[PDB]
């Protein structure tokens, strides 16, 4: 690691902006992958108390 405390904690719980193209896709499957990415379940450090969610953009 060799990272400082506050910068390392910031990068871990930071948010990220996903992008998705909805051309010829069903609203459910894009919703299924999106919803898990909204709580931050994809993050191995997930916890419901910590709002570690990430943004999602659909087109």
């Amino acid at each position: 690691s060799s990272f400082s405390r506050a910068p390392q904690q910031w990068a871990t719980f930071a948010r990220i902006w996903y992008l998705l193209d909805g051309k010829m896709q069903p609203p459910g499957k894009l919703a299924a992958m999106a919803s898990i990415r909204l709580q931050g379940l994809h993050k191995p450090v997930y916890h419901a108390l910590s709002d570690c969610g990430d943004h999602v953009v659909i087109m």
Binding site: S1, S2, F3, S4, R5, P7, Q8, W10, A11, A14, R15, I16, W17
Partner: protein, 275 residues
């Protein structure tokens, strides 16, 4: 009134307990408080931390010059600890520098000594000594004792320990206790620095390599109020360090800090101190 006094007794214990919490008295020395024997305590204390030597050297270390002023003052109305503290802190500085430079030859004499000055500082030494009951044995004029006076008494114990046991046992003492407090805090927590990338380019010229360039590798939330950049420092198209940060400047200086740790060998994933 209903009969009985047992309930009224324990209630007075509850009243004085609340009166204690409401208006507590100021603290005092443990010698003032009951159940105290002076000679037996330093003896029992010496056996606690596994040290055995003459009481003349012990009492001379715990005694300060300030208490002698009040002692003779109250007498009208013996030996200080300056020499012991002098030799104590002298050997500690040389010994701490010895083990640190042997483990980290890459660290310069400037930064390695500032760390030794920190571990031998007031807040660190007094915290170790406060949690080793040196405050109860030390005697001064004012209570709570100052940190500088308590610091002098601590090294005075190191001096008396040096004269009796030897350097090897004194080395084992200061090595074990102080370094364990160093395990927690990383370099730039106690040893703060200015212009890290400037110091980085200075160090890299000593190591005979080119001037690196800062380049953002990854980005997120740039226009957002939570910017995030992964800045990496490359020289000759080869990377050394990568550092996150809020802005490009915070990520740049952080990446400069990341290189300084591994350059001096103070990485978080380095070999812990053997015993």
């Amino acid at each position: 009134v209903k009969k009985g006094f047992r309930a009224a007794f324990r209630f007075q214990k509850e009243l004085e307990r609340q009166r204690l919490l409401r208006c507590p008295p100021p603290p005092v020395r443990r010698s003032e408080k009951p159940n105290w024997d002076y000679h037996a305590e330093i003896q029992a204390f010496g056996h606690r931390l596994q040290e055995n030597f003459s009481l003349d050297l012990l009492k001379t270390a715990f005694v300060n010059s300030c208490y002698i002023k009040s002692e003779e003052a109250k007498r009208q109305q013996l030996k200080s600890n300056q020499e012991l503290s002098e030799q104590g802190t002298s050997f500690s500085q040389t010994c701490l520098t010895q083990f640190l430079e042997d483990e980290y030859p890459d660290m310069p004499t400037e930064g390695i000594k500032n760390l030794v000055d920190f571990l031998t500082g007031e807040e660190v030494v007094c915290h170790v000594a406060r949690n080793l009951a040196v405050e109860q044995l030390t005697l001064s004029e004012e209570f709570p004792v100052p940190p500088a006076v308590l610091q002098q008494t601590f090294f005075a114990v190191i001096g008396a320990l040096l004269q009796s046991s030897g350097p090897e046992r004194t080395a084992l003492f200061i090595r074990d206790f102080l370094i364990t407090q160093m395990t927690g805090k990383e370099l730039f927590e106690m040893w703060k620095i200015i212009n890290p990338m400037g110091l980085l380019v200075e160090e890299l010229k000593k190591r005979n390599v080119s001037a690196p360039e800062s380049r953002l590798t990854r980005q997120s939330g740039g226009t957002t109020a939570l910017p995030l950049y992964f800045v990496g420092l490359y020289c000759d198209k080869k990377l050394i360090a990568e550092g996150p940060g809020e802005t490009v400047l915070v990520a740049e200086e952080e990446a400069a800090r990341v290189a300084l740790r591994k350059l001096y060998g103070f990485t978080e994933n380095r070999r812990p101190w053997n015993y």
